[PDB]
Amino acid sequence: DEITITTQPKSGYVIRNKPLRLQCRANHATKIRYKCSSKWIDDSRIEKLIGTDSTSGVGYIDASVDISRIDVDTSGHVDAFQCQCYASGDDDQDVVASDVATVHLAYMRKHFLKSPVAQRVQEGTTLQLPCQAPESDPKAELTWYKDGVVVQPDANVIRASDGSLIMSAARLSDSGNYTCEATNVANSRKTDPVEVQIYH
């Protein structure tokens, strides 16, 4: 009969030393191959699970491969590294190609594009503490910590869309050691603590 793809391979990230696993499943197919950016993935790397659907009697083949950082780096198309699945069978059936799955190397650099700095400032002063994550993929999420406690926005302190922390009228209770943390699936990094003194 006709070959169609049941599970489509999904884009995703290679994180640290953990390959990205693509899974691809096709009904009425006998062979699945993976081609990634003009190169063919060596068929010995493909882990196949073959059977017949008990309910409908329709055969299937479920193939998965681990795409590694070695693969992406040796491709020649690192910034457009993308993979596809090919379901063939009898001499009479048409090869059916899958969706394109893109594989990216997830990372987070070491240097914060914006980081706070120590301040000694008088009570009532509006103080703004900047923070912007290091260049990262996927995008990072910021959390702010005051002496180890996650800062909770209220009436005087607010988290601004640019990632900074704003205290409208600095209370004495706002003094402390502040740190910004950036997090994504690849790493989690904190600025060195800066000190904030509020006096009168």
Ligand X SMILES: O=C(O)C1=C[C@H](O)[C@@H](OS(=O)(=O)O)[C@H](O[C@H]2[C@H](O)[C@@H](NS(=O)(=O)O)[C@@H](O[C@H]3[C@H](O)[C@@H](OS(=O)(=O)O)[C@H](O[C@H]4[C@H](O)[C@@H](NS(=O)(=O)O)[C@@H](O)O[C@@H]4COS(=O)(=O)O)O[C@H]3C(=O)O)O[C@@H]2COS(=O)(=O)O)O1
Ligand Y SMILES: *[C@@H]1O[C@H](CO[C@@H]2O[C@@H](C)[C@@H](O)[C@@H](O)[C@@H]2O)[C@@H](O[C@@H]2O[C@H](CO)[C@@H](O)[C@H](O)[C@H]2NC(C)=O)[C@H](O)[C@H]1NC(C)=O
Helix (H, G, I), strand (E, B) or coil at 68: coil
Give the interface segment with ligand Y, choosing from 130-138, 149-157, 171-179, 183-191 (CB under 6 A): 171-179
SS3 call for 72: helix
Question: Which of 49, 58, 160, 172: binder of a second copy (CB under 8 A)?
Answer: 49
User: Does 147 interact with ligand Y (rule: CB under 6 A)?
Assistant: yes
Beta carbons of 27 and 4 less than 8 angstroms apart: yes
Closer Cβ to ligand Y, 134 or 176, answer by number:
176
- Residue indicated by tokens 């690192």: 78
Of residues 16 through 45, those in contact with a second copy by CB under 8 A are: 16-17, 43-44
DSSP 58: -
CB of residue 147 vs a second copy: minimum separation in angstroms? 8
Show the beta-strand stretches assigned E in 99-140.
101-108, 119-122, 127-129, 136-137
Using CB distances below 5 to 8 A depending on partner kind, what does residue 68 bind out of ligand Y, a second copy, ligand X, none? ligand X
Angstrom distance (rounded) from CA 130 to CA 18: 33
Give the total of residues touching a second copy (CB under 8 A): 16
Asked if residue 140 binds a second copy (CB under 8 A), the reply is: no
Binding residues for ligand Y, rule: CB under 6 A, are 44, 147, 175-177, 195
